[PDB]
Structures are given as structure tokens and as C-alpha cells.
Amino acid sequence: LFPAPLLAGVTATCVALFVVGIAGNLLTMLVVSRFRELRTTTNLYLSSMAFSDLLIFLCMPLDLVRLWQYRPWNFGDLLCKLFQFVSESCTYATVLTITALSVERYFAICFPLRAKVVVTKGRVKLVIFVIWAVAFCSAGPIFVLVGVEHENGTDPWDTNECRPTEFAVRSGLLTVMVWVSSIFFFLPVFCLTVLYSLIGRKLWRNHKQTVKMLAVVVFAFILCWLPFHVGRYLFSKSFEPGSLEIAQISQYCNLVSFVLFYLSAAINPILYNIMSKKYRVAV
Amino acid sequence: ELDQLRQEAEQLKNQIRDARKACADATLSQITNNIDPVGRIQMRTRRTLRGHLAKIYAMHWGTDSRLLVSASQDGKLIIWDSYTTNKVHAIPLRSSWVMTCAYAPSGNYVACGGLDNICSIYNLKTREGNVRVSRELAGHTGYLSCCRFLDDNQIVTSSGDTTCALWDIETGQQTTTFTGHTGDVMSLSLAPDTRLFVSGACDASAKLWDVREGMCRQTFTGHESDINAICFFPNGNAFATGSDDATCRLFDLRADQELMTYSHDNIICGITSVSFSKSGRLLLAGYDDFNCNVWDALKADRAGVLAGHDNRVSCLGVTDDGMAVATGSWDSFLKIWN
Amino acid sequence: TASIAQARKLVEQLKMEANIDRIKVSKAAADLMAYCEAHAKEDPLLTPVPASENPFR
Amino acid sequence: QVQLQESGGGLVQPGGSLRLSCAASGFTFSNYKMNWVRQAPGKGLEWVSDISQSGASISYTGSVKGRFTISRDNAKNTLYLQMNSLKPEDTAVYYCARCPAPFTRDCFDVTSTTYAYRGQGTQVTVSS
Amino acid sequence: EDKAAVERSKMIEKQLQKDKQVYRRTLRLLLLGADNSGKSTIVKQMRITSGIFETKFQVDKVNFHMFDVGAQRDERRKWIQCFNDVTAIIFVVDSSDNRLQEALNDFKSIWNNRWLRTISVILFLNKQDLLAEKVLAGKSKIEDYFPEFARYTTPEDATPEPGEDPRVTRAKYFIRKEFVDISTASGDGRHICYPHFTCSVDTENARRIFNDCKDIILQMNLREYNLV
Ligand SMILES: CN(C)N(C)C(=O)[C@]1(Cc2ccccc2)CCCN(C(=O)[C@@H](Cc2c[nH]c3ccccc23)NC(=O)C(C)(C)N)C1
Ligand SMILES: CC(C)CCC[C@@H](C)[C@H]1CC[C@H]2[C@@H]3CC=C4C[C@@H](O)CC[C@]4(C)[C@H]3CC[C@]12C
Ligand SMILES: CC(C)CCC[C@@H](C)[C@H]1CC[C@H]2[C@@H]3CC=C4C[C@@H](O)CC[C@]4(C)[C@H]3CC[C@]12C
């Protein structure tokens, strides 16, 4: 599938994003672990997000083989299922940490004197645990959704592909998973837009650069994640009768969504860390 | 008459200058040049003490060389065990603006004071097992800057009202009052024999006081700005003063003048604390820039640097056995170095 | 009116500082050198101690 | 020792001029901001003017702006105040003070209770 | 034994955390002013040989500890350093024009001090009824102390505070502009001066402090939350 140059470019950009994102997410964790004065609540959320992004990138090579190298998935079925589960759980954890970080930024800006009391750092670790628990619970159905399949007319060694199982396609599990995933786009996007719009209203009433970076954060989130969920929905729809003409659209959309999905993990440290003077000096 | 006495004072100043110049047959540098440099003094942070919410203003080692009290302006004295970093006591203060703390040589009491103008003496060995304010020495008309126990019943304090005071803790009244400084008295160092103490008092001058007679035996000048710290040389015949002019100076009581000046053109910040090592070969000085410097007290060379504090180094202290040096900073951490 | 007394207080005080028995600076420098030389080996910071005897290790 | 010795100034007719000088000893004169302060009869100490280490920054109190000019000579460790168009209200003892610490931008040197780093002052009288 | 020592240390550390909560949730203010400034009266408006006084008051469930220097000498370059971490310095200055240049110099020293160079100043230009009476009377002239006032004219964007004769507005805004010039001419946005025209009888002074602290804390939150 696809032209070879297209996927060559995809893998090149993905390797570049791999190095960049690994560097950023390692830097965040090292800076937060070494420096005691940097163990603030926002930096705890960002350390969790850095871990999630690092795990996504570590899973990236397997996904890229699954997409480009096309070496038949002779590896364990448990490996396919578990690595998909890890990738999905880290995705949901990153999204939920972004949402929690926006909600904590809305406080401490619109209620600077209330946040000094209401926000408790002891509870922040519980919040991170709850984020991760929800991510795991939501990515749990991956073990029912994904599996190693083969072309019915060939040996189960030259066409083994880790993919959503035909049973899931037939049983309707695919669509319900698509909508459950879309929850992790609609809730974060609405929350971010509303809360950062209120923050921008207050600050506008330096502040110009703060508002500009908030707009950049929301725009980057939308750019990276709207193609992801739209491509998942298209891929689900492409298996219905008469959907032959939209199969190519789904393929291209999911390729661009792959690129942007890993761009998101590469860029999160840039969006949330380097904008801080304290972080930059800490580096 | 005012003018007559002024002329007499100036003539006596000239006489004293000429006498101490006549005594200045040779310099310390010209005498110590033949001794081998101390080498590069490399020291590492063995311990870091955490628990103070605000900047640390003073610390003092116990005579056992293990327990140390620190004072923070969040309103707490913490007595730590430096070996394990266990907190032995945490005393909440009635006034959070504490600028000094002291550890009784017997270990039974600590003292602290500050902008409240009161020296609070805390009993550490109560039968009930809880620390209490044993006494509240009042009578100073300005913030306490330093305090130091002579004994479980006597403590000498320096104040921003330009005077020092020797107290009787049992009766809580100034046994003696030491006057003669014109600026705030910033620090005092008690002599090893406890029969004398020196004080540096924001008038670029240090003074030597006899505890029993209550009079100023000698006045030493040479600094260009306020003296923030003063420390006795281990034999008790000399002392070092650090000041805001970014230089430390060594004074000898018997020669009655300044022997050595420890400064570098790259240092343009004031000295906040000074201390001598066990043998007196190393002079450790904390600075307004966030790191301390270790000087060869004899050759006046900067032998080493202690970096590791993110803010002002406010207090310094060497154990009685000389095994480690504690540095406390405005970042609220005490670091033990060895 | 009290300032005239203070000057007096200063003047007389300077006298008790001029009449002390000072010594040559060379003697003081030699005494400090002798003390440091005598006590050098007893100073852990000047002479780092073996890690076994260091209580902070 | 840190000492500041001021000379010049005395009895002068209104509308006259006077050049006060101050010789500084015991400290590196070029590292400190210098100030002119004054005490009029029956009043407290009042800051008159200030000049920075290199003289690049100068400031005057409003009551004297346009009449007095402050200067310093670091090679000679001297501070000068040239006072033109003397007024009867300028009758006062003039003290030369210096910043308590070097390389600083702030000063705390008008205090009555024996600020250590100012001189004994020189009387400047304007009368008929 | 060592186990008992560790247990005692942990018991102490629990109390230390309990106290850290209160310490972090409370805002500390340093009240500075001269003898003629009515700061002593402002303290009495905070109706909820010692060297320091504390008045603790509450606004919208936020606790403020305001510290007034008590029995101290007039030399302040050393004990002022104790206040390098307060959230704000409330600097009260009397408008009587003459002590104004003295107050300007005090504000300049506070502003440019190395250890107070990140602390914001809430500037209470106190005693404005007295300022109005003095200006209207015409006997005292600001030009005799500040010659630049001879050519200062009120900005067109200045709030008028209805009911003020234009002379009063011109004088009060010139006095404000003096301190604002001092505050903006040195340093940078690392700290901000918040000028207010106040009277010791004003019942809203506390509220003003609150409104300013919200801003001061806000400016730090932008840093603490990686927004700038
Ligand atoms: C080839 N593989 C690598 N890719 C990139 C794919 O996009 C796919 C094949 C494909 C390739 C090219 C063009 C068109 C379709 C399409 C998209 C779906 N899908 C996944 O595997 C999904 C499984 C899933 C998890 N919750 C869902 C909700 C609704 C639909 C699906 C899922 N999970 C991920 O992708 C991970 C978790 C690794 N992030 C396989
Ligand atoms: C199971 C895998 C997939 C994910 C588990 C999430 C883990 C890695 C998360 C959850 C809570 C997080 C911790 C929250 C608080 C702190 C304290 C701080 O001083 C260092 C980082 C540290 C210790 C975080 C490291 C990462 C962390 C342990
Ligand atoms: C892609 C979209 C959703 C990005 C949202 C941008 C947010 C973060 C910010 C950026 C600039 C902000 C605006 C800047 C200025 C003003 C004027 C003010 O009187 C009302 C609020 C308003 C109108 C702000 C609303 C929120 C705002 C639009």
C-alpha cells in the first residue's frame, strides 16, 4: 500500500521526531528529578506527560515496522496486543494530563488567591494516579480489539499483520471504541478552549506572549488530534458496504494522523516546558 | 569643650596610628612566604538538611560536633542530628523574624532573637520531654543580631541599638552593658577562654571587650564598610572580620592592627559569615554571591570554593573537632561539607 | 548638650587604647604560623581523614 | 580609617557663591556613590544631592536644582559642591555622606543617629 | 535507639508539613512609613520595647500578616533585609507640600535595594483630604519644592475622581507621577508599584491591598505555571 517514497518520507520524519521527542522527554524528567525546587505541581504533571510521551516514542518503532517495513508480524500476538495497549494508554494519559494542566492553569490565574489554598500538592499525585487509572481502563478494550490476523488464502507466516480483528470490525466494537476515543478529543478540546479563552480574557483585559502561547497550545492540540480521531472514524467506516471510494481517503488520513500523532509527543515538551524561564535556566 | 576634645581625640588617633605603625616591623605576607601553599581544598556536600520553609538566618554547632541548631525566618529553630539528618527538635518561635541562634555549650539550652529585640532562652532538657521558653531577656532597644552562651546562666548578646549586653539568665537582667559602637552591632565572637569577646558593628570597626570589667580594651579599624561577621582565631590571639566592602581581614590582639586582607578583584559582594578551621590554617567565608570561599589564612590565597547554594549564604560554622563545615543559605537548606 | 560629654568619653577612651603594650607584628605572624604548623595534622578539613573515620560517610 | 573632611563654606551674602570640598580617606573613593546632605538650624537632616561612582548619574533636591552642581574627582578622592545664587534658607551645616556599601544603587545615609560614613560638616551661613 | 529517633523525626516532619500549609496560604506585608505618614492610623483600620508589631487581618478568607517596625533605630539597611520574601511592601507617604523629597528618597532606596528588587510596593499616598485643603488654600506652593510642577499639566487619560477642583487633581497626579517615575525609571517588570490615593479614614484600604496582592500573586503564577 501507498507509494514507497511517501512512506520513506514518513519514516524519515518519524525518526527525526523520535530523536527530538526522546531528547525533550528525557530532559524534562532529568531536570525535574535533579532539581528539588522544580518539583512543583505543574512539573509533576509534566513529568507524567514526559513519561507518557517517552513510552509512545519507545513504542513507535514497532508501529513504524507495522506500517512501513511490513515484515510479517511473526512476533507474539501478546506483543502486538500489549504494545497497542501501552501506546493507547500513554495517549490517553497524555491527553488527560494536558486537560488537568489547563484546569490547574485556569486556577492560579483567574483565582490567584483561591488557588493558594484550594490547590493541594498532596492531592496532585492522586490526580496523576487517577489519570493513569482512567487511561488504563479506557485502553483495556485494546486486548479485545486488536490482534494478529492473516490473509485467509495464504500461509499464517508471510501475511501476519497486527491490526484490529475482523471480529471487532464485525461485532461493532470498532465504532464504540471510536466514540470512546473521540471522548478524549472532545472533552480535552472544549476544556482547553474554554479555560484558555477565559485566561486570555483575564490577561488581555508578559501577557501578550502568554496569550499567544496559549493560542499556540490549543492550535497544536487541535492540529495533532483532530486528524487522529477523524482517521480512526474513517477507518471504521471504510469496512462498510460501498465504502470502497473512502478507503483511500482513510488510508491517507491515517498516514497524516500517524505523523501528527508522533509530532504531538515530540512537541509537548516544547509547548509546556521551554516557554518557562525557570526550566530554561534549569537546563 | 567640644572643639578642644575633638582636637585631643584626633591627636590621640595620630598617636595610636604611629604606635601601631612602629610595631609594624614586618608584614604577615613577608613572613609566611616561605611556607608551602595549602593546595587546592576540594570539599564535597556530605549532607543536605531540608525542612526550613524560609531563608535560614543563623546556625550554630553543638559542642558534641553532631547536633546543630538552625534558625529560619519562617519562625522555627530546628535542632538536627547532622550524622543522620534526623530532626531532633523543632521549636516554633513567638516572633518569626529571628536573626540569630545559639547552642549552649552544655547542650541543655538554645537561644534565639531578632527584630523582636528579645533573647529567648529555650530549655531542651525538660522533664516533661517538651521544649519550652525558659526565659525572655528583654532590655535591648534594637534587634538582636547575635547571641552566644558563656554558660547555662550567662549569655552575651549584640543588638542593633549599638550596644552589647551580658545577661544573668536566672534573674533575666543585664549583668553588664558594653557601649562604644556607633552603628548596629552585627556579630560577636566569644573568646576560647570566655574572658573576652570581639564585636563588629556596622561602623567599619571591631572592638574587644572584657566580660568582667565591661570595657573596650581595643578598637580595630581597616574595613571600608559594615562588618557583618567576626570570628576568633583558634588560639584566641587573633580574629577575622568580613564586611560589605567584599574583603575579609585578620587582626591580632597583641600587635593591635590588621595582618592580612583576603580579597580578589573578581569578588564585588559582601561577606556574610566567616569561620576558621580547627588549626586556623583555613578561613571559610560565606558571600552575598551564592557560594563560599576557603582562604589560606596564612598566605591569603583562595584555596577552595564551596558552591551549591542557590541563594545568599547567610551562615557558616565549623565543628569543634573540625570534621565538617555547615553552610546555611537563604534558599532554606543547610549543607554539611567535608 | 550631652554631645560635649560624648567627645570627652571618646577622648579619655582613646588614651586607654594608646597605653597598651603592643608587640612587633613579626612576633604575632610567627605565633600564628607556629600554631598552624603545630595543629595542621589535627585539622580534618586541612588534612582530609580516611573515609572510615569520617562520621559523614 | 574611613574619614570625610569637608572644607570651604562660611559666611556669604545672599546671591553669592561657595565651593564646598570634601576629602575622603580610608576607602576606595571611586567605588561608592557620594551624597551632599545638610541640616538647617532647628530642623532635621536633609538630602541635598547625589553623584554616582563615575559621575554619569546625578540628582538634586528640588529646592536647589539649577543652583548647585555636584562633582567628584576620583584621582584626588574629592567631592565638590559648587553652590551659586545662595539663598537665606541655605543657612545650614553641610555634610558629605557616602553610600554604605560599594557598587550599590541605594543609599541609607540621612539618618540622625550617627550615620558612620559622613563627616562632621561645615557651616554655610547666608546673611545680610 | 535509631528507630525511636527516626520515629521522632517523622513525627516532627508531619507537624512541619501541617505548618507549611498555613505558611504558604498566608500573605505577609511590610508596612513602611514616616512619622508624619498616617500609617499608625491605617493599622487601626485593619479591624480584622518590642521591635516589631504584627496585625493579622482577613479579606475574602485570605489571611494577611502586616508587619510594622517598632522600636528600631533610624538606620534600616540591615533589618530591612529580613523582608526580602514578603509579598508586598505597603509604603505610606503623607502628601504635605516639606517631607515629600524625603519620602521619594525612601521609596527610591526601597525600590533599588538588591534584596528588595523583586518585591512589589503598594504605595498609599495618604492624607488626601489634607492635600486638597492645602492645595485649595493656596498658601503652600508645590513649585517651591518641585519646580517641574510649574509646567506639569494633567494627562488627558487621568481618571478625574468626580468632585475635585482641577488644581487638586493636578497636584495629586503630579505627586503620584513622582513615585511612578522613580518606580519605572529603574529595574524592570520584575516588580510593580501600585499607587493609591487614600485617607486614613478610608474603609476600603484593606480591599485595595487584596486587589493588589491578587495581581502580585498572579504575576508569580504566570512564572510558576510555565506561562511566561
Ligand atoms: C497501520 N497502523 C500502524 N496504523 C497506523 C493505523 O492507523 C490503523 C490501520 C490503518 C493504517 C493505514 C491507513 C488506514 C488504516 C488505522 C487506525 C486504527 N488502528 C489502530 O491500530 C488503533 C487501534 C485502536 C485503538 N483505539 C481505537 C478506536 C477506533 C479505531 C481503532 C482504535 N490504535 C493505534 O493506532 C495505536 C493505539 C497504536 N496508537 C490501525
Ligand atoms: C505504569 C506506567 C505505564 C505509568 C505509571 C506512572 C508513573 C511513572 C508516574 C505516576 C506518578 C508519577 C510521580 C509523581 C510524583 C513524583 C515526585 C517527584 O519528586 C519526582 C517524580 C515523581 C516520582 C513522578 C514520576 C512518575 C510517576 C511515578
Ligand atoms: C483557536 C481558538 C479557539 C484559540 C483561542 C484563543 C484564546 C486562548 C485567546 C487568545 C486571544 C484572546 C482574546 C484577547 C482579547 C480579548 C478582548 C477582551 O475584551 C475579551 C476577551 C478577548 C476576546 C480574548 C478571548 C480569548 C482569546 C481569543
Q: Please state the domain extents for chain C.
A: 3-57
Q: How many residues does chain B have?
A: 338
Fold adopted by C3-57: G Protein Gi Gamma 2 (4.10.260)
Residues near B198 by beta carbon (within 8 Å), at least 6 away in sequence = B188, B189, B191, B206, B207, B208, B209, B230, B232, B239
C-alpha B144/C-alpha B184 separation (Å) is: 10
Domain residue spans of chain D: 3-126
Residues of E in contact with A116 (CB under 8 A): 24-25, 62, 217
Q: Report which secondary-structure segment, H or E, holds A281.
A: helix A277-282
Q: CA torsion, points E207, E211, E217, E219, in degrees to nearest 10? A: -160
Identity of the residue in A105, A117, A277 whose CB atom sits nearest the CB atom of E223: A277
Q: What are B307's three cell numbers?
A: 558552591
Residues composing chain E: 228
Gap from CA of A125 to ligand 2 centroid (Å) = 8
Nearest partner of A105 among A276, A278, A222, judged by Cα? A276
Q: Chain B, 16-45: which have a CB under 8 Å from a chain C CB? A: 16, 19-20, 23-28, 31-32, 35, 38, 41, 43
**DSSP SS3 for E121:** strand
Write E11-17 long-range contacts (CB < 8 A, 24+). Answer: E12/B87, E12/B89, E12/B90, E13/B51, E13/B87, E15/B90, E16/B51, E16/B87, E16/B90
Output the residue whose Cα is nearest ligand 3's atom 19: A205
CA distance E209 to A60: 53
Which residues of chain B from 126 to 185 reach within 8 Å of chain C, CB to CB?
180
Nearest by Cα to B271 from B257, B261, B279, B259:
B261
What residues of chain C lie within 8 A of the CB of B2, using their CB? 3-4, 7
Distance E209 CA to ligand 3 centre (A): 29
- Using a CB-CB distance cutoff of 8 angstroms, which residues of chain B are in contact with residue A37? 310, 331
At E26, give phi and psi (nearest 5°). Answer: -110, 145
Q: Which ligand is nearest to the CA of A123?
A: 2
Q: Indicate the SS3 state at residue D91.
A: coil
- The CB-based long-range contact list for A7-12 (8 Å cut-off, 24+ gap) reads A7/A67, A7/A68, A7/A255, A8/A68, A10/A67, A10/A68, A10/A255, A10/A258, A10/A259, A11/A64, A11/A68
Q: Which of E120, E132, E74 is nearest to E218 (CA)?
A: E120
Give the gap in angstroms from C-alpha E69 to the nearest C-alpha of chain A: 26
From first CA to last CA, the distance across chain E in angstroms is 50
Is E145:E97 a contact under the CB 8 Å cutoff? yes
**Distance from C-alpha of E42 to C-alpha of E209, rounded to nearest angstrom:** 12
Establish whether chain A is in contact with chain E, requiring a minimum of 3 CB pairs below 8 angstroms. yes
Restricting to D residues 78-117, those with a Cβ less than 8 Å away from any Cβ of B are 100-103, 114, 116-117
- Fold classification of D3-126 is Immunoglobulin-like (2.60.40)
> What span, in angstroms and rounded, lies between the C-alpha atoms of E49 and E54?
14
**Ligand with smallest separation from the Cα of A51:** 2
Q: Single out the residue of B189, B276, B294, B190 nearest to residue B233, CA to CA.
A: B276
Q: Say how far apart CA E187 and CA E193 lie, in whole Å.
A: 12
Pick from A57, A88, A173 the residue to mutate for probing ligand 1's pocket: most ligand atoms within 8 Å of its CB. A88
Q: Which residues of E touch D87 (CB under 8 A)?
A: none
Asked if B327 contacts B286 with a C-beta cutoff of 8 angstroms, the reply is yes
Single-letter amino acid code for the residue at A20? V
By three-state DSSP, how is residue A206 classified?
Answer: coil
The β-bridge partners of B165 are B157, B177
Q: How close is the nearest chain B Cα to the Cα of C54, in Å?
A: 8
The ligand minimizing its distance to the Cα of A197 is: 3
Residue pair B142/E73 in contact by the 8 Å Cβ criterion: yes
How far CA A92 is from CA of A66, A89, A268, in Å, comes to: 21, 5, 14
Nearest-Cα residue of chain B relative to residue C38: B279
Closest C-alpha to B319, from B43, B41, B82: B82
B53 touches chain A (CB under 8 A): no
In the β-sheet with B292-296, what is the strand arrangement from edge to edge? B271-276, B282-287, B292-296, B302-306
Assigned C-alpha cell, C7? 567627645
Of B133, B179, B131, B171, nearest in space to B154 by CA: B171
In order of A16, A71, B57, E30, the CA distances from A9 in angstroms are 11, 18, 61, 62
Alpha-carbon gap, residue A54 to A15, rounded angstroms: 14
Q: E22 CB near a chain A CB, below 8 Å? A: no
Ligand 2 centroid to Cα of residue A97, in Å, is 12
Cβ(A147) – ligand 1 distance below 6 Å: no
The subunits that touch chain D, with at least 3 C-beta pairs less than 8 Å apart, are B, E
Nearest residue (by CA) to ligand 3, atom 23, is A201
| Number of residues assigned to chain A | 283
Instruction: Please tell me if residue B254 touches chain A, with a CB cutoff of 8 Å.
Output: no
Which of E7, E82, E86 is the best substitution to test chain B (most B C-beta atoms within 10 A)? E82
Resolution (in Å) of the shown entry? Answer: 2.5
Any B CB within 8 A of D3 CB? no
DSSP string, B41-101: ----EEEEE---SS-EEEEEE-TTSSEEEEEETTTEEEEEETTTTEEEEEEEPSSS-EEEE
Sheet holding B334-337, edge to edge: B45-49, B334-337, B325-329, B313-318
Interaxial angle between packed helices A41-64 and A244-269, expressed in degrees from 0 to 180 and rounded to the nearest 10: 140
A128 close to ligand 2 (CB < 6 Angstrom): yes
Cell of A10: 514518513
A106 lines ligand 3 (CB under 6 A): no
Query: 3-class DSSP state for residue A26?
Result: helix
Whose grid coordinates read 510596593? E121
CATH number at B119 reads: 2.130.10.10
Query: What cell numbers appear for D27 in the block?
Result: 576607602
Ligand 1 touching residue A181 (CB < 6 A)? yes
Candidates E190, E210, E226, partner chain A, best to mutate (most A CBs within 10 A): E226
Q: Which residues contact A116 (CB under 8 A, 6 or more apart)?
A: E24, E25, E62, E217
Answer yes or no: do E226 and A117 touch at CB < 8 A.
Answer: no
- CA-to-CA distance for B129 and A131, rounded, in angstroms? 45
Task: Answer for the pair B117, E71: CB distance below 8 angstroms, yes or no.
Answer: yes
Element holding E184 (H helix, E strand)? helix E166-185
Is ligand 3 within 6 A of the CB of residue A204? yes
Strands D122-126 vs E62-69: parallel, antiparallel or unpaired: unpaired
Cβ contacts of A143 within 8 Å, gap of 6 or more: A81, A85
Kindly list the partner chains of chain B, i.e. chains with 3 or more CB atom pairs below 8 Å: A, C, D, E
Selecting from D102, D116, D120 the residue whose C-beta is nearest the C-beta of B183 gives D116
Which residues form the domain of B238? 2-337
Produce one character per residue of D94-127: b if its CB has 16 or more CB atoms within 10 Å, e if not.
bbbbbbbbbbbbbbbbbbeeebbbbbebbebbbe
Q: Is A245 on the interface with B (CB under 8 A)?
A: no
R_g of chain E, CA atoms, integer Å = 21
* Chain E residue with minimum CA distance to B90: E12
Give the relative orientation of helices B2-22 and C3-18 as an angle to the nearest 10 degrees. 20
Please identify, by atom number, the ligand 1 atom nearest to the C-alpha of residue A247: 14
Tell whether E226 lies on the interface with A, counting CB pairs under 8 A: yes
Residue B77 and residue B110 in contact, taking contact as beta carbons nearer than 8 Å: yes
| Selected residues 13-72 of chain A with any CB under 8 Å from a CB in chain B | 36-37
CB contact under 8 A, A37 and B50: no
The partner residue sitting opposite E113, judged by closest CB among D66, D106, D113, is D106
8 Å CB contact of B277 and C43? yes
* Contact call for residues B315 and B294 (beta carbons, < 8 A): no
Q: In what order do the strands lie in the sheet with E62-69?
A: E52-59, E62-69, E26-33, E88-94, E120-126, E193-197
